[PDB]
A paper describes a structure:
We report an in silico strategy for the biocatalytic synthesis of chiral N- and O-heterocycles via Baldwin cyclization modes of hydroxy- and amino-substituted epoxides and oxetanes using the limonene epoxide hydrolase from Rhodococcus erythropolis. We have rationally engineered the epoxide hydrolase ReLEH with construction of a general platform for Baldwin cyclization reactivity of hydroxy- and amino-epoxides and oxetanes.
After screening 576 transformants with automated gas chromatography (GC) for 95% library coverage, a distinctly improved mutant SZ616 (Y53F/N55A/I116V) was obtained, enabling a 2:3 ratio of 6.7 favoring the Baldwin reaction mode, although conversion to the anti-Baldwin product 3 was only 13%, the rest of complete conversion being. We were pleased to discover that when using triple mutant SZ616 (Y53F/N55A/I116V), the tetrahydrofuran product 10 was obtained in 96% conversion with a 72:28 enantioselectivity ratio (e.r.). In order to gain insights on the active substrate-LEH interactions, the X-ray structures of the key variants SZ612 and SZ616 were analyzed. Consequently, the representative substrates in complex with LEH mutants, including the models SZ612‒(R)-1 and SZ616‒(R)-1, were constructed by molecular docking. Following the docking analysis, the epoxy ring O-atom of the substrate consistently establishes a hydrogen-bond interaction with the protonated catalytically active D101; the aforementioned hydrogen-bond network with water molecular is terminated by substitutions Y53F and N55A, enabling the substrate distal hydroxyl moiety to form a hydrogen-bond interaction with the deprotonated D132. Moreover, for both of the SZ612 and SZ616 mutants, the slightly shorter distance d1 was observed during the simulations, indicating that the ON atom preferentially attacks C1. Furthermore, to better illustrate the bond forming and breaking in the Baldwin/anti-Baldwin selection pathways, the hybrid QM/MM scheme was employed, enabling the calculation the activation energy barriers. It is of interest to note that the shorter distance d2 allows a relatively low activation energy, and hence the formation of Baldwin product is favored for the two variants.
Residue numbers in the entry:
A (entry chain A): 4 to 148
B (entry chain B): 5 to 148
Amino acid sequence: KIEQPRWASKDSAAGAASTPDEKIVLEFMDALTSNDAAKLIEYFAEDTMFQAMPLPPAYGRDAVEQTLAGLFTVMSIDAVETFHIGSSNGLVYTERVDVLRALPTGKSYNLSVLGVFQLTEGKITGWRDYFDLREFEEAVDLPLR
Amino acid sequence: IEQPRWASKDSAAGAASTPDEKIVLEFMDALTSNDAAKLIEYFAEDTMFQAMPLPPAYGRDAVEQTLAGLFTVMSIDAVETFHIGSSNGLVYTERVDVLRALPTGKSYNLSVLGVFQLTEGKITGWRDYFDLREFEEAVDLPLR
């Protein structure tokens, strides 16, 4: 389904977790397809934040969970393909496609996402996904902003 | 530029710790030249650029035309890289690009997460992820 971008690194290491933190992030990417904020929130420290960057940030584990829960009321993460994962300084970066499916319309969209995760002691203390919201909105006829 | 509330206070977070990251950080600063002919020197011949909301440019020439194209309507006034990291020949920059739309004189602080692939110190891929509409609406400039 998810084609390898032409620009994807052909260094096969780039797409695999090479550290405990990158491993957690890829496990978390897999967990995203649960569409289950209660499951996902277990990856997060209390002192954390989440931001789909087109949308407002959620600060604190509670806000993260409820903000995630809110997203999963309207969209399913059907698949997450991480082409590149890297990390430095406690930040993990993921270049991904998230196959998103708007529940109201049933339309799916391959969201090109570059995500950054701050981990502290194996828990997510920051997760920001960068992507273009409009193209997603217009594709799936789902008003998010 | 205000450091986001989530910006690593770890000072090594925003600092290049590898030759690639150094090149990228230097490239970020070189973006404020708004000079596609200067910028393209950072790029390998086999390269690509994509502001991810917009079509990619493949090939050094296509990247230069695209950057030159972007600079006719947009000034990169500042690039603040909060976070830079790298693995496996990829450099990641979490940044704010202070963008100023030339036709409107309006500026916007664009939250960008960018990825750079470098081969032998040359950029073989540069993809910036951000939300275009927020930028378009902030600067009254429909780039799409």
